[model samples]
Structure formats: C-alpha cells, structure tokens
Target: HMPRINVNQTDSGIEIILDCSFDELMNDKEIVSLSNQVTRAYSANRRANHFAEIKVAPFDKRLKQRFETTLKNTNYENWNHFKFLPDDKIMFGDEHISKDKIVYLTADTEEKLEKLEPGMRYIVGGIVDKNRYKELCLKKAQKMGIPTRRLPIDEYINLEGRRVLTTTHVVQLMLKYFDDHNWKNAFESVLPP
Candidate 1:
C-alpha cells in the first residue's frame, strides 16, 4: 500500500490542507514549531494507514525555508504523501476545486464534527497565530461559502475552559478516530492530562 503512494491518488480523496500563508507573520521560532507539527502529522497519518493527501500551499520564502530545513533534518527525506503547492495564492481561495467538497475545521463553528468520511477533504488552518488570528479559518470558509465544523470536543470531554489545540493534535485525533471510530480513545491518546 505504501509503495505506490502518488500513482493511485485521486482528486476526491481525503486531503488535509494547512491553509494559510505562514511566511508573513510567524517568527523564526514559531515557524520551526509549525514545521515540527507538520512532521508529526505526517508520521501519524502513516501510522494510521490513512492515505490522506496533506497539502501545504501559499507559503513565503521564509516559511518555506524553515519547512524545508525541518524536513531535511528529519529521518525522512522525501515526503511523497505531502504536496507543497506553489506560493501563488491560498488554495481555498481558488475555485478550481469546488468549495462544497472541502470542509474547514475551526473552533468558531457550532456544528460538531460527527464523523470522518472517506472522500471529503478536511482543511486545517496552518497559521500559528495562537488565537491572535481569531476566527480566521471560519471567516475564510464562510467567505468562500464552504461548510465548516468544529471537533466534538465539548461532546466528548468536560473542558474547564475553551482552549484550542495545535495542528498536530487535530490531525492525529482525526486519523486515529477515523480508523477506530472511537472518539474517547483518540482524544485521550492524542491529548492526555
């Protein structure tokens, strides 16, 4: 299954988008952290055998530099599962791909994610603004008329406060729960107190 990764890929398959321009505002340290999170995402996807196309697009030179540097230092050199699109425009802003097929994940959405379907693409905002970019993902999805859903955090856990998670945790939980259909184990394994 892992040998021919890109040869059997499809347009309507599962996709995870880091859907923001990280090059503009992120500091050097934050950029490194974001890149590290991406590595974790890749590793988790591989472990779950969930052949999802993970895309990172519309990046600036600085962000791209750190991204490449981080991957280079890792044991894995070439990421066949990952697509680094050109820095022309944000992938979600374009109309080449139908917005209906993409579901943006954000904390602002009231609709909780019920299940991880096979074909629908899930877009996670790649920016590490740390809540500085409030409602950024939701706003972009709304502006494009794309559907948005938040993880069922409240449904599964008794949270003391509204604290969001990093991209790595989100990807791991989604993939893990998608495989087992167990939200409790996924949430607990990904984030345990």
Candidate 2:
C-alpha cells in the first residue's frame, strides 16, 4: 500500500494576499525568485493543517508574464484556495472587505500582530528586494489607508540577523500558528535556527 498524504482541503476563513504590484521595481532575477517563493507559499498552504485562502493581486506585467511562461509547467491556476487577481488594487473578488478588516503585514510597522483573526485579510508584499526598498509595503498600505502590523518575532524569539522574512516563511508561520494557537511553537517549527 502507498503512504497516504493528508492535505488540508478545508478553508480557515482567513485570507492572505500576496501584493505583486512591485514587479516593476524588481530585476529579472528577483522576479524569478518571487515566482518561486509564491509557488512554495502555495504548497505550504495546501499541506498545512488549516489552509488560508491566498490571493495574488495585481498579477500582471512582468510577474504575470513570468508565471504564464516560465511557470506554466507548475499549473498554479488549478491550485485550490488560490486566486490570481488582475486588478491593480487588492480587493477581494466580488465582495468588498472594508479597510478596517484588512491588515498589511510589513516589517516596517511598529504594531505587532498578536493573533490572527478568521474574518481578516492579511496582505504580504510579494517582493524580493533584499531590503533594498525599505518601508515599501508600509508606504503602500499607508497610502491605501489600511492598517499595518508586523509579525511578533521579538515577542516569540530572538532572531540574530534582520527580522525580515520571506513571503513563503510568513505564510507558513501563519498556518503553523493555527495548528496549536502558540506563536513560539510556530516560530520554532517554521523559521530557520
């Protein structure tokens, strides 16, 4: 008999958005890295115990072209709980989620996210700039008049280097937190030592 793979098919009612509007700012190599990170994020969400609905907003221009061409073999379109929005803005499909209900997760923010609520949508900037563009996501959220929160990294663990996490790591850490409602355990399991 083959080993069975138990995948989380149920929705956790929490939505995460990968804001891909920063494509124009990245070089060719960074765009490719971003695409790969998005793929990993999708896989992590699918295999987690509770899956959050992920939306990739403004999936156009170079990033869109890259996904349609280089990443065509991945067949990301068929992934469950995944959405690719062509609109420039990060609006939920059909229904309109108010700005208060949405939170953009950026390292530049001073507010720490203590917990994840089911009805809220969290936006993670889908850029791989290696800290070249500081406050990029924070500024965008501020311009849109949306609230911003940073991960509770300091409260949970002491990271030696920079506090910035990759797009995939953020997604995985959020999913891991839902497993047992413990941030320390989630950080330990999802983050690098």
Candidate 3:
C-alpha cells in the first residue's frame, strides 16, 4: 500500500481567492458552471507539486446554495488548502494584510502580470458569464484601489480567439508556472488544445 503525502499541506505563501461575489449576476446555468470550475480548480491544486492557498470568499447566495445542494457530499470542506468564507471581503482571513499586497487578475486591464511573487494574494473573479459583464473584476478592483494585471499572454504566446481564460485554467497555469518557472511551458501544459 502506498502512503499519500498531501501537496496542499505545503503552502507557498501565494494565495488565490475565488471572489464569488458575482453570483447574483450570473444565471442558474452559469452558477452551475462556476461551481464546477471551482471543483476543477481544487483538483488542479491538489494534484500540483506545490499548492497555492485557495479561498472562496463571499461564499453565499446562489453559489453557496448550489454547492450545498449539488456538491454537498463532496470533500471540499475537508480540503487543507481550500477555505470557504462568508465574508464578501477578500481578506483570506488575514485582516492585517494591506491592500497593496492584493492583485486582481482581469483581462480588461492594460498592465501585464510580470510574475507571481510569494505573499501576494491574487483574486480571480469567480463567475461564468461568457463575457457578458465587461470590466466586472477590473471595476471592482479599481473601486477598491487595488492594482489589476492580466496574465502576460501576449508577451509569451498568442492564443486564438478571446484571451480570457476560465477560472480553472488560470489556477492550473499558476500551479504549472510554479513547477516549470516558465510562462510558456505553463501555458502549453495547462491550456487545452
């Protein structure tokens, strides 16, 4: 029998927050897709060589209800690196952390993310609206005075169609980057063909 060593137990000090505050904006079907993406994101983190602390903040309203009803039997609650918080604020349960350390990842932003540094919490807006809501994450970040940076997709590789990536893809790419330390390799490994 093989014993298991949980990768999630090793925190890299880089946190990924799935901001589910947009639950009200999405329809029923989109909410389901969002929930599934969250599950996939969790699986990606679990299988990675290193784990980034994952948090689902503002885990309430339709999204919370969907998880409780559709995914209630799952072991998401027991995940060592995953946390579901009721508070809408993306503090990741650390109130002492300053706003400067928080960076929101959005496609509409002009700046490109140079690198993923430790101790910085990256916020990924948890919604599956298919681009229905424009500048949603960017506007929220701007209102909060937090800096926003999109993934350096153009610098490394040119993707077909929309550059916007799914929540799971973003999470997987970040994990892959930690392993390879190369954006091109990370994108190539995680992105679908």
Clashes per candidate, residues 3 or more apart or on different chains: 0, 0, 0
Please write out the lDDT profile of model 2 over residues 15-69, one tens digit for every residue: 9999888978999999989998998888788688888989898889888899899
Instruction: Show where candidate 3 strays beyond 4 Å.
Output: 1-9, 92-96, 156-159
Residue pairs clashing, model 1:
none
Q: Candidate 2 — which residues are off by over 4 angstroms?
A: 1-5, 92-96, 156-159
Q: For residues 20-102, could you state the per-residue lDDT of candidate 3 as single tens digits?
A: 88867988898989999998888788788888989999899998887888898775677667889988576533663556798
Model 2 TM-score, 2 decimals: 0.91
From the highest lDDT down, the ranking of the candidates is: 2, 3, 1
Candidate 1 lDDT score at position 142: 87
Worst 10 residues of 2 by lDDT: 1-10
Better of 1 and 2 by TM-score: 2
lDDT of 1 by residue, 1-193 (tens): 2433334323324677876565677787878787788777777766664557677766557666765664555543366667677662434444534555678899888998888776567888787777787888888788867799999876655567445778888888877675567787878888785
- TM-score for each of the candidates: 0.80, 0.91, 0.90
Name the better of 2 and 3 by TM-score: 2
